[PDB]
Design an enzyme around this catalytic site. Structure first.
Site, PDB file in Angstrom:
ATOM      1  N   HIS B  80       0.794  -1.247   0.000  1.00  0.00           N
ATOM      2  CA  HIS B  80       0.000   0.000   0.000  1.00  0.00           C
ATOM      3  C   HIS B  80       0.816   1.283   0.000  1.00  0.00           C
ATOM      4  O   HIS B  80       0.278   2.309  -0.332  1.00  0.00           O
ATOM      5  CB  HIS B  80      -1.032   0.115   1.114  1.00  0.00           C
ATOM      6  CG  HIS B  80      -0.414   0.314   2.463  1.00  0.00           C
ATOM      7  ND1 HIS B  80       0.053  -0.740   3.228  1.00  0.00           N
ATOM      8  CD2 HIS B  80      -0.130   1.442   3.161  1.00  0.00           C
ATOM      9  CE1 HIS B  80       0.569  -0.269   4.344  1.00  0.00           C
ATOM     10  NE2 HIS B  80       0.480   1.043   4.325  1.00  0.00           N
ATOM     11  N   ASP B 104      -0.140  -7.696   1.474  1.00  0.00           N
ATOM     12  CA  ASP B 104       0.287  -6.277   1.493  1.00  0.00           C
ATOM     13  C   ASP B 104       1.752  -6.090   1.465  1.00  0.00           C
ATOM     14  O   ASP B 104       2.251  -5.246   2.215  1.00  0.00           O
ATOM     15  CB  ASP B 104      -0.260  -5.539   2.709  1.00  0.00           C
ATOM     16  CG  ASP B 104      -0.213  -4.014   2.488  1.00  0.00           C
ATOM     17  OD1 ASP B 104      -0.138  -3.505   1.327  1.00  0.00           O
ATOM     18  OD2 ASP B 104      -0.140  -3.315   3.429  1.00  0.00           O
ATOM     19  N   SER B 162       4.424   2.333   8.602  1.00  0.00           N
ATOM     20  CA  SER B 162       4.152   1.014   8.083  1.00  0.00           C
ATOM     21  C   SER B 162       5.244   0.600   7.140  1.00  0.00           C
ATOM     22  O   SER B 162       5.727   1.423   6.344  1.00  0.00           O
ATOM     23  CB  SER B 162       2.810   0.968   7.312  1.00  0.00           C
ATOM     24  OG  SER B 162       2.499  -0.422   7.207  1.00  0.00           O
TER      25      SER B 162
END
Ligand code: NI
Ligand code: NI
Ligand code: NI
Ligand code: NI
Ligand code: NI
Ligand code: NI
Lengths: 196, 196
Positions: B80, B104, B162
């Site tokens: 992402h 992801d 992240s």
């Protein structure tokens, strides 16, 4: 692969009188008078206007990677949230139409629709749509920073909230709650509206 | 457009004994003995291994949209964060090699290199590289959630963190600190390492 992102409505856009205020400081416009008084001054076939969660299917369930706004049939979000990816809404594929990497913005289905401009010293509300929370209006007083001179906001929201809209007292969108530099401030990310 | 993302090194990977602990609970392995004692148990031409900030050029300056790790010449981050975008490091263009939207994850310059597997009941450290902060080791005790059965972590970091790596006591990476569902937990996002 592909079509990994989809939208879900979460709220409508408005200014809430009596919304929670947050921030280091307040900007309050005072009217003083000479007489000694002082005063503190049809269904359309288009996606329903509002605020939507942008969701990516993961292993623990769908995670929210950002937020955007449909207005006049156009979906507006942040360039870093989708990077031009197709978005699924009601089985339909939404393709990107315009982007500005520099302002970190993108629209799907037409050109940038927002008309709001923010003015130094006025306070605004962020309609923060945090992952797993109800939408919340947060009234705050932006500072300005120089380059366009840009509004910037010192508020901290959960990852995934970027693209939430920032509205003025008239309920018009002055920009989208951006990614920040860090003293973590996010730009009031806005573009001029589009034309034929 | 294009090449809007670039990398900057921020840290090396390791487990820090005596790192800060955070979380609701601790998992502590105790050894009991029958005798009444109880015990609490050459320059290479490759990108330098480490943790790097992934940065996007904005209006207020470069903002951090995520983190990743070079290991054995391969850059590992979250799907992402880049969605397969080229990454600039030292004037060179890094092209994506492998991705898993479902986990992801994405790697640039080769296949997934991490070998670490996390084991229920062990604690790990997140090497959180938050925007504008120094890297910080955070020791935490993941829970597990069912689907692969997956580790999940209840810690809250700033937007942009992240892709920070999660290491075990041996200093091996067991996964990357993911996006969460919400009770905000992020998956320990890991893939099997790759082969000829
Ligand atoms: Ni494809
Ligand atoms: Ni106050
Ligand atoms: Ni973001
Ligand atoms: Ni291009
Ligand atoms: Ni504790
Ligand atoms: Ni993220």
């Amino acid at each position: 692969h592909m079509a990994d992102l989809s939208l879900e409505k979460a709220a409508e856009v408005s200014w809430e009188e009596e919304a929670e205020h947050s921030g280091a400081s307040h900007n309050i416009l005072v009217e003083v008078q000479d007489d000694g008084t002082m005063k503190i001054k049809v269904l359309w076939d288009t996606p329903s206007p509002g605020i939507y969660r942008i969701l990516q299917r993961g292993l623990l369930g769908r995670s929210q990677v950002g937020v955007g706004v449909f207005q006049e049939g156009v979906f507006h979000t942040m360039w870093h949230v989708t990077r031009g990816a197709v978005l699924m809404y009601q089985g339909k594929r939404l393709e990107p139409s315009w982007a500005s990497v520099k302002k970190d913005l993108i629209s799907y289905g037409g050109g940038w629709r927002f008309q709001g401009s923010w003015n130094a010293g006025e306070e605004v509300q962020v309609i923060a749509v945090e992952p797993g929370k109800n939408p919340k209006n947060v009234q705050t007083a932006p500072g300005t920073f120089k380059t366009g001179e840009v509004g910037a906001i010192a508020l901290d929201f959960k990852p995934g909230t970027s693209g939430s809209p920032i509205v003025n007292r008239e309920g018009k969108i002055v920009g989208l709650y951006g990614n920040g530099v860090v003293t973590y401030v996010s730009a009031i990310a806005q573009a001029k509206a589009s034309q034929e």
